[PDB]
Amino acid sequence: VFNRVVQIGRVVFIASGKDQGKLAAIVNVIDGNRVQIDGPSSDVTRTVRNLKDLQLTKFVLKLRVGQRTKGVKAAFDAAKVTENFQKTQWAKKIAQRAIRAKLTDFERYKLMKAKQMRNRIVRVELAKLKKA
Amino acid sequence: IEPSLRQLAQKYNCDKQICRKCYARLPPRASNCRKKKCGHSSELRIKKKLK
Amino acid sequence: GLSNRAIIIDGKNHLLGRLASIVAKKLLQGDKVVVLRAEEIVISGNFHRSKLKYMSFLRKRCNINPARGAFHYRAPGKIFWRTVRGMLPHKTNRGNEALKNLRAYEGVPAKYQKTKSLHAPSASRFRLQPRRKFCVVGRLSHEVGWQFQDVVAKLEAKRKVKGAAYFEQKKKMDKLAVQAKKNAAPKIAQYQKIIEALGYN
Amino acid sequence: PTKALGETLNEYVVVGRKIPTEKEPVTPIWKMQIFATNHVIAKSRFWYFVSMLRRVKKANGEILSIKQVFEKNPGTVKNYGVWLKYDSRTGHHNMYREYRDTTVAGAVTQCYRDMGARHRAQADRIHILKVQTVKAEDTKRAGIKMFHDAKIRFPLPHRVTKRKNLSVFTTARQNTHFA
Amino acid sequence: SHRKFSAPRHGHMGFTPKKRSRTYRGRIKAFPKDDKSKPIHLTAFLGYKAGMTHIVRDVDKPGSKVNKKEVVEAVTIVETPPMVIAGVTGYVDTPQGPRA
Amino acid sequence: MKLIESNDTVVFPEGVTFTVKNRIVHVTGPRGTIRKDFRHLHMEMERIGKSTLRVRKWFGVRKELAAIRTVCSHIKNMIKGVTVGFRYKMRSVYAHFPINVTLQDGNRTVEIRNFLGEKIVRRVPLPEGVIATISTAQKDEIVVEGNDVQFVSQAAARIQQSTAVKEKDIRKFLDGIYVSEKTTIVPT
RNA sequence: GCCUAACUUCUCGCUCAUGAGACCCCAUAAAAGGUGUUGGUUGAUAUUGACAGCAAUCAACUAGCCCUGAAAAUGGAUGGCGCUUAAGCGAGAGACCUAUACUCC
RNA sequence: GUGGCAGCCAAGCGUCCAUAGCGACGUUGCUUUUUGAUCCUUCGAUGUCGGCUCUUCCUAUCAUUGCGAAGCAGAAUUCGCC
């Protein structure tokens, strides 16, 4: 029933707190609530975080218990975890929201016009399909 | 009645333990009463055997 | 922060007191609130606790004249209404005007049978530990005197059948809409470029 | 009464001695490791313990030094054993407890919180006799030992997520299972 | 102080308030449960209390002291001329009760 | 303490299948299928292999961990019920009055008469999927048979508790129908 | 949490009570008990394979919460509603609210 | 305090057997239907005993409903529970 697990080498996504929005790798498990993570190549320092702020990704690295920052960096770069993560809809939505949050007034106007024109055309096509 | 049937009926009617606080009919090999009213008393007595 | 329309809330899988306090705050802040399926609201703790609490509530009646004493409503809607009343200054004009803006129903009346309902995740029953019992206000009302549990069940079954048919139709229309966008791709490519560049898709 | 106020108690090394007199021109120097919120509390607790152990009080003594101690390597996980003595509502008891932490100060803070949680014991009724790092094979508590596994794995079964900066009401469906 | 000697209360408190009936005609507060299998039939009628008299009948009550004996019993006559059916109405269930 | 992980497995013999999902089990064998709902416990039940069903609990407390072997025992009883069924043999004990036992309503109701000489008739309906039989060979023997142990034993206990002595000490007024044996239908 | 201005804010535990508990004076509870659960102390046995049945276990203690001990007369009181990974119990952290008090005008 | 009611340990009674039912020497409580103690309210007045009548309430349950235990083989009787 559960696929992703909290295991050494599991790549986690920081959902809230200090380094929000970044990726790290679980290098140790302290107790049922706390994990030692270290995202050397994603600008996350080796720290201990409460699992309540973390979310499990689909990537698991080939790490060792308490792998040092150098080894974590090597595994991260070898697996290309950042590139593979950037291909998921998880990361695409974050990128889209990042673009959206910084829209200027002119960009908002342009989006309004383009969106309504596209909706009108798609509605014409939908009427065609519905009639048939 | 046949002695085997005697035993069968006594297993259900007589071979049991009685709590000394709530008179609960309890299993023979029990350590505490199961009733909350006595606070699960640990002191029990055998159901009074045919003397 | 006022809402233009009334806030329609589906009461299913909601904790009684939590939802009641949220709704009371909204009513005090000036919104109109409608609660649907009040028979699906949940109370934490085993059924016996709630049943005995309601029995002790029923025991509170004026000795001189019960027609003045506490009025013990059995319908789930009125139970929720009284729970919200408890969290308002209902003896003052402010509290009375706030309470008059609340409508709680069992089932979904025809007026709201075609509107989307809201939920309060901070009042959901899934914030309880999984190994904890809970009671359903519908069952409590039935056991304390409510007489229309079967009627509401039948009406809800019919409503769910009609909704299932409507949802099948809606899925078909949604697939047609996806196909229409795919067909329009060549014409909308000029606008899709801007939409994706600004990050909306 | 003394309280373990503050996230992550600090650790201090306090060195003091009885003020020399004519009959005792040179006096022994005592050193203690104290866990407190700040150095004022550290000094007060040092005098408390030193007066309990030797015939000297703050009036006749002086503090040669007081220095905060910082964890050497906070980037490694260790098992800490804590020997403590505490007062219950009825009698006096000795306890041995174990924690897993990156800092000894963090482990002692965990000990104080745990004692408060499980025994309703306040900081004024707890004495930390000793704190050390124990090896994995030398631990003797199931809760700690269960994490001495290189293949440890587990999911997060029933995740209730709190919406932070958005309206109370939503039409979204809430999901507690994440596979 | 408790009453010295016990005695039941006078009257039935479930028949209060002892007020004049709201209407002159009797209101049927409940009808017999409907069984779909039986033939269609009416469940009530209207009559007038004409008066009382007494009759003699033979009692068939095995085991009774008046078995196969004649007894005198008081009876009431209710004149019930035929009624006329003038309309049809139906009731639909709602969350608040049946509704015409 | 919340133990991180605790599980137990059930291995199915040949000719039996389970197809578990959503904490609902659908065991099926030669004598039909039994469906059981275990949604009152929050454990993960899955198929590990081809004939092994694992029931696992993550971060459970003593009371929750106590239910893993309970669920496993229930599934084992399901297997036994679908393979060899359940048969409870009960014996009538009486001092003077023969306890007359009969079946009515299409063999769906057990009627007990003359218990201790009472003229009342005791009626016990049988649950669906449970049958009763008065042994012609062994006198004073009733047999309750079925796939589901819960329902078979519930019917047997209903019959046993139906014949209870009142206002007379039970230490020697031992009349009644008592479950003498709990066995299987197919000779194991 | 709502009455009620100020978080259903953050961290770790404990507790299920067939009306649990909930904050100085303060608005009662004891001797004595529980194989409910959670921690500890001591003494033993156990891989020269510990107890049960034809891989840890046993025993005695101890103290947190819960339970029994716990009966009164108009209907009734953690202030009320309600609250159960709490809105309870204990240790803590940020912020925030509020006097005719403090600073300034 | 006194009155009333309920517990804890078991020396004994109970043919034998401390606990079926009791329970001494001790000891812990609860109640305000006794009587005391006090003097807080009322002396520009709260009509001061009992009975009669009539409501309602509490149980610390005599009877009745459903049960458990006996030194329960049954009219009968005793103990306890909801």
PDB file of C-alpha atoms (C1' of nucleotides) in Angstrom, chain F residues 165-173, chain H residues 66-67 69-75:
ATOM      1  CA  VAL F 165     -32.334 -23.363  34.123  1.00  0.00           C
ATOM      2  CA  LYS F 166     -33.995 -20.660  36.221  1.00  0.00           C
ATOM      3  CA  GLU F 167     -34.537 -20.463  39.991  1.00  0.00           C
ATOM      4  CA  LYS F 168     -32.866 -23.869  40.444  1.00  0.00           C
ATOM      5  CA  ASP F 169     -29.199 -24.242  41.274  1.00  0.00           C
ATOM      6  CA  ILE F 170     -27.240 -25.174  38.155  1.00  0.00           C
ATOM      7  CA  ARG F 171     -24.656 -27.134  40.154  1.00  0.00           C
ATOM      8  CA  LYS F 172     -26.791 -30.258  39.735  1.00  0.00           C
ATOM      9  CA  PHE F 173     -29.746 -29.266  37.510  1.00  0.00           C
TER      10      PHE F 173
ATOM     11  C1'   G H  66     -33.534  -9.286  34.310  1.00  0.00           C
ATOM     12  C1'   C H  67     -29.467 -11.482  36.654  1.00  0.00           C
ATOM     13  C1'   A H  69     -23.310 -16.154  44.690  1.00  0.00           C
ATOM     14  C1'   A H  70     -24.460 -19.578  48.744  1.00  0.00           C
ATOM     15  C1'   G H  71     -23.025 -23.701  54.321  1.00  0.00           C
ATOM     16  C1'   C H  72     -28.553 -22.624  46.631  1.00  0.00           C
ATOM     17  C1'   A H  73     -31.559 -30.556  46.089  1.00  0.00           C
ATOM     18  C1'   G H  74     -37.805 -26.859  46.947  1.00  0.00           C
ATOM     19  C1'   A H  75     -42.891 -22.803  50.258  1.00  0.00           C
TER      20        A H  75
END
